[PDB]
Write a protein that binds this ligand. Structure first.
Ligand SMILES: *C(=O)/C=C\c1ccc(O)cc1
Length: 125
């Protein structure tokens, strides 16, 4: 394992050092998005929750293609405001239900240390 706790105050500093292989060692799902919602990184734990193959969704748009159940003011809406503002740090519960058994999760969205990249962290609840 990579020991990093979900919701940690400095998590963006910690994950700045990880290559895709290290992200696969986290205890929770991790997705890196650009400012347009395109998927830059997607880890193994996220594929285990949603059944998506990580290598197959890199490059796709999260909100438009992969995860349209998040295309809502409660999720996408918060993301877009955060990108527009250049600051994002929010946690909420959500249900993932697109082409899968409905799965209640905790979502943590946070701006990355780098310019135009954003993290989505996910864990089961
Ligand atoms: C809502 O769209 C649920 C499905 C889904 C699929 C993949 C990811 O990563 C999140 C949500």
């Amino acid at each position: 394992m990579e020991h990093v706790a979900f919701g940690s105050e400095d998590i963006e500093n910690t994950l700045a050092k990880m290559d895709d292989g290290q992200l696969d060692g986290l205890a929770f799902g991790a997705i890196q998005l650009d400012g347009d919602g395109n998927i830059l990184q997607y880890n193994a734990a996220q594929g285990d929750i949603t059944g998506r193959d990580p290598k197959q969704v890199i490059g796709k748009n999260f909100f438009k293609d992969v995860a349209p159940c998040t295309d809502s003011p409660e999720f996408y809406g918060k993301f877009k405001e955060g990108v527009a503002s250049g600051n994002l740090n929010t946690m909420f519960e959500y249900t993932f239900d697109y082409q899968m058994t409905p799965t209640k999760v905790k979502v943590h969205m946070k701006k990355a240390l780098s310019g135009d990249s954003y993290w989505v962290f996910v864990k089961r609840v």
